[PDB]
Design a protein around this ligand. Structure first.
Ligand SMILES: *[C@@H]1O[C@H](CO)[C@@H](O[C@@H]2O[C@H](CO)[C@@H](O)[C@H](O)[C@H]2NC(C)=O)[C@H](O[C@@H]2O[C@@H](C)[C@@H](O)[C@@H](O)[C@@H]2O)[C@H]1NC(C)=O
Ligand SMILES: *[C@@H]1O[C@H](CO)[C@@H](O[C@@H]2O[C@H](CO)[C@@H](O)[C@H](O)[C@H]2NC(C)=O)[C@H](O[C@@H]2O[C@@H](C)[C@@H](O)[C@@H](O)[C@@H]2O)[C@H]1NC(C)=O
Ligand SMILES: *[C@@H]1O[C@H](CO)[C@@H](O)[C@H](O)[C@H]1NC(C)=O
Ligand SMILES: *[C@@H]1O[C@H](CO)[C@@H](O)[C@H](O)[C@H]1NC(C)=O
Ligand SMILES: *[C@@H]1O[C@H](CO)[C@@H](O)[C@H](O)[C@H]1NC(C)=O
Ligand SMILES: *[C@@H]1O[C@H](CO)[C@@H](O)[C@H](O)[C@H]1NC(C)=O
Ligand SMILES: *[C@@H]1O[C@H](CO)[C@@H](O)[C@H](O)[C@H]1NC(C)=O
Ligand SMILES: *[C@@H]1O[C@H](CO)[C@@H](O)[C@H](O)[C@H]1NC(C)=O
Lengths: 164, 164, 164, 164
């Protein structure tokens, strides 16, 4: 059971290489962050930075699977003027959509879902909060060597583990 | 994509409780199986027994959506004299149509289709291989406590996991 | 130093999920194997089946990096009539090139190279034994849930470890 | 792809011995650095010190091949009064052209290009930002035992690793 409002790390189902907003990797003040990607921490594999899920249905203590929710990074340090809230933006250099921070709670572009996938989970992003949704996977194109979460063809199988 | 000929578990989109033909659940020799239902494994949830999809178009290597196919259970054990092939039968002791094994390849009553259902899928059954097709859902009436697949008004949203 | 004629396991740089020719996964006699893929062993991660490198330059005891070589599976069991030797074939369902067994030593399509990539290695496949080469990576398209090695855009970072 | 502004190690395509400006290798304050060479770290092999690429076209987010760019060392320590920017100087004590730091952004002598070299890459230097460009290779003459980058007839095949 995934709990509303409680911090979890998102990890690949088969690795301990977690994820962080880019601004937190760089760890310095930024004038702005027009495209703050969520990148994988790989050398060495590190747990990353937690997130919190907020179901569209405000009344729910347990996060429903396959239902609209918001995602935001849980971090007391933050080096962007923009929000911690996840969204999706278009990018030329990454040749399409990428997950980024700097969103807005309950906006049209803010909606993701957690869905079962094999014996674990996938994230999907749902434009306008409805189908058709797009799986969230790993991309490298335009990443210059790093891996970043993006709406993809192939979902990243993930699991959630409670933070600290 | 679902590949023709390859075994997949059928699973509810939000659950880990999969499905087995009753005869395999009982695991004992049967004199006949006039109504071998596909029952859900719930206590505890278990992935069940895989199936294989065979499109009506035998050229097809990838199973298409919204086209006639057969389904059969993938199991080396089999405790009924009848086949592993899925079909639909009427049962007054279940007040209506039920999914069962014991069908025949390419027969009038053997045709199902996989369709999109929101962010995932559903199975429908197509009498004589034509529309109207009816959604396959979960029933309980006359299951002696067990839940089993049956054509009904509301579909069961499902996902597919390649076996393993 | 990678030694000519000596068996190694190819592993991803950051996982213990190795690789096997499909025919060895199935472990039964096949009438033929028109497209025997090299698939990753993931549930649970397993070391896989070794390979042997044979440099184009027959005189060499140490495998040269960035030079033409052949690859063949090292296995006393074999369930295909075709060879253990790696090559690349076109596939419709996988939407392009895939690595397969069933090749021929020193043929035009038999040539791969091991090249340094970050702190480890990549495999590339070199049509006709010359540039331009294509990185070998992981693909899923048309794999029905499995991952298979294919000429790709993005290389799989790999390491080699001596077998048993 | 190499991204403008992002740090990468330059590494020989088949080796782990990378490169550092001499002043960083010595790690001691210098009164001037008339010829701060880029020397290879060999005993043992070490990845060295990253550089950043800046295309002459400042619009460009991805570094293109065969176009004028500047290179500079990425280091917070710096022991020369001169800059981190790469250039080429004549040195009669090295019998000819050598790569050095201490250049100036966008100057006549500051232009290098990344070109394809077989299955990998090479750096060339372009006097006045035009052809003919000369290959950058490794020399040793007058290096007091050390190997250093220098324009020459034979290129050093290189690869690039994003820093880390
Ligand atoms: C379900 O029914 C099967 C009946 O065919 C069982 O297989 C049989 O198991 C016997 C006792 O272990 C064995 O003497 C028989 O040879 C075998 N019959 C066949 C055709 O294989 C099966 O038992 C399981 O599998 C066997 C091979 C052992 O591993 C047992 O420990 C298992 O219980 C029955 N399975 C279950 C889970 O009840
Ligand atoms: C290379 O030169 C640097 C000279 O600036 C060294 O940094 C200096 O290290 C001193 C002794 O540790 C320290 O008191 C100084 O504050 C510091 N200077 C500056 C500007 O940072 C450096 O020494 C290494 O780094 C320091 C911070 C410590 O970690 C030492 O243990 C290191 O040796 C010299 N580095 C090497 C590898 O020689
Ligand atoms: C990162 O940034 C914060 C705030 O600027 C600083 O206090 C902290 O020490 C930094 N370094 C590391 C290694 O976390
Ligand atoms: C929230 O969820 C409950 C139970 O699933 C439901 O009864 C209620 O109507 C939902 N509220 C909204 C606003 O969707
Ligand atoms: C069956 O599928 C093949 C491959 O897509 C197609 O070309 C062929 O026309 C189809 N046959 C029928 C009867 O629909
Ligand atoms: C696989 O196949 C071989 C030869 O047919 C057989 O002898 C072996 O026991 C098989 N099973 C396993 C689990 O390796
Ligand atoms: C094999 O390699 C050696 C050293 O690299 C070389 O001298 C020799 O000419 C090579 N032979 C062939 C046939 O390429
Ligand atoms: C620089 O690159 C941009 C983006 O590709 C291009 O559109 C522009 O025309 C280029 N400018 C010059 C001077 O080449």
């Amino acid at each position: 059971a995934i709990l509303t409002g409680v911090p979890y790390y998102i990890l690949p189902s088969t690795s301990r290489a977690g994820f962080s907003p880019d601004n937190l990797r760089k760890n310095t003040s930024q004038p702005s962050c027009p495209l703050d990607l969520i990148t994988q921490l790989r050398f060495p594999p590190r747990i990353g930075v937690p997130v919190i899920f907020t179901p569209q249905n405000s009344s729910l203590k347990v996060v429903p699977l396959s239902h609209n929710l918001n995602i935001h990074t849980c971090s007391d340090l933050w080096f962007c003027p923009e929000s911690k809230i996840w969204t999706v933006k278009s990018s030329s250099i990454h040749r399409g959509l990428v997950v980024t921070t700097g969103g807005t709670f309950r906006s049209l572009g803010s909606w993701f879902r957690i869905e079962r996938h094999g014996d674990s989970y996938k994230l999907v992003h749902c434009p306008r909060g409805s189908t058709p949704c797009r799986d969230v996977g790993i991309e490298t194109v335009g990443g210059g060597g790093r891996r970043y979460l993006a709406p993809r063809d192939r979902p990243l199988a993930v699991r959630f583990t409670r933070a600290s």
